[PDB]
Design a binder for these strands. Structure first.
Ligand SMILES: [Mg+2]
Ligand SMILES: [Mg+2]
Ligand SMILES: [Mg+2]
Length: 112
RNA sequence: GAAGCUGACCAGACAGUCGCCGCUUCGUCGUCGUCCUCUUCGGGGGAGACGGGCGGAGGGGAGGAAAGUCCGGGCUCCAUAGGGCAGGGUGCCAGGUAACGCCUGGGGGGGAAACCCACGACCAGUAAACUCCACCCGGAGCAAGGCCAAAUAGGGGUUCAUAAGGUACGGCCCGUACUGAACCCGGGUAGGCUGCUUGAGCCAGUGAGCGAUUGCUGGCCUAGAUGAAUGACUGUCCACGACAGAACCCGGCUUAUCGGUCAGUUUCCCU
């Protein structure tokens, strides 16, 4: 089962503060990814995009949707970690294929 | 036939593998210390409500601007001697609306798309050049509050309540009872459910009004999420796809929009 239930998202900011105080760098000159270990056995991810970086509410939402579709497909492969995503400045200019390959280009060096 | 305007619709459809939400129902497991009857009452059976009570089934899920600080209202909480000053808005006539800086029909001028413009007394006093002449004008907001869970005083003062609080006017003073308040000796809901999508709606028939709009009769009810809900490759009538995001709701205008199909309208004149 490749479902994406409620127990796979960082709801409260406490998990965000935990990931911030225990971070490991894994970013590009465009997108930065952080994370930390947990204990539930299944990995969880957080979604944080800055409104000041890019406006246009169809954007940011598109980034969230693409990130969810890229994360929920590899939940049975990558180890159990508490991830978090952030979007920098010039990110809304890329299309879907470029963003997808850029997101899949980072998770290869996550051998933790 | 080419070019320019206004109005109407659209700015994708179909299938293509897994998934996110909420609506209804189906049985299923606990709680009822809910109800009723039998009972071994260690309780069982049935009816309701709640809980992740586990899956199945059915049918669903972003606009012509959802976007703005540009207006008006719906619905709550707080507050409010009646007397003015001060400030703001509106200012051709007549209608629409629940209201309006919104809509419509006339007149004057402006004039040609200035067929759109302040068009309230330039003499009542030297006016998209000033005073004034009338009407109106509390504040904050679905994190408003409402219901619960839960909360766990701090013996109260120089003692007066007058200038602790301009009490509310509140920008100002006339004062209406002008108002219960200093630091120790302070510790306290962080959660849940409703508001919440039936809309001062939509469609059809039929009168009224030059117009905006409306009288009457029938039918329709699958965004409401809470780091906050839209991805997959093949063909296509692929108009080769652009501006863009719901967050309590409604009525207008204000920006942004590649463009495609019709209707009306003018110039070009092979026609
Ligand atoms: Mg919006
Ligand atoms: Mg409050
Ligand atoms: Mg809306």
């Amino acid at each position: 089962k490749l479902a994406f239930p409620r127990e796979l998202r960082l709801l409260t900011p406490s998990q965000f503060t935990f990931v911030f105080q225990q971070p490991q760098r894994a970013g590009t000159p465009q997108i930065t990814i952080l994370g930390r270990l947990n204990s539930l056995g299944h990995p969880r991810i957080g979604l944080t995009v800055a409104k000041k970086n890019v406006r246009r509410a169809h954007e940011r939402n598109r980034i969230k949707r693409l990130t969810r579709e890229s994360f929920r497909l590899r939940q049975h492969e990558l180890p159990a970690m508490d991830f978090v995503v952030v979007a920098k400045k010039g990110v809304a200019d890329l299309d879907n294929r470029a963003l997808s390959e850029a997101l899949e280009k980072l998770w290869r060096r996550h051998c933790r």
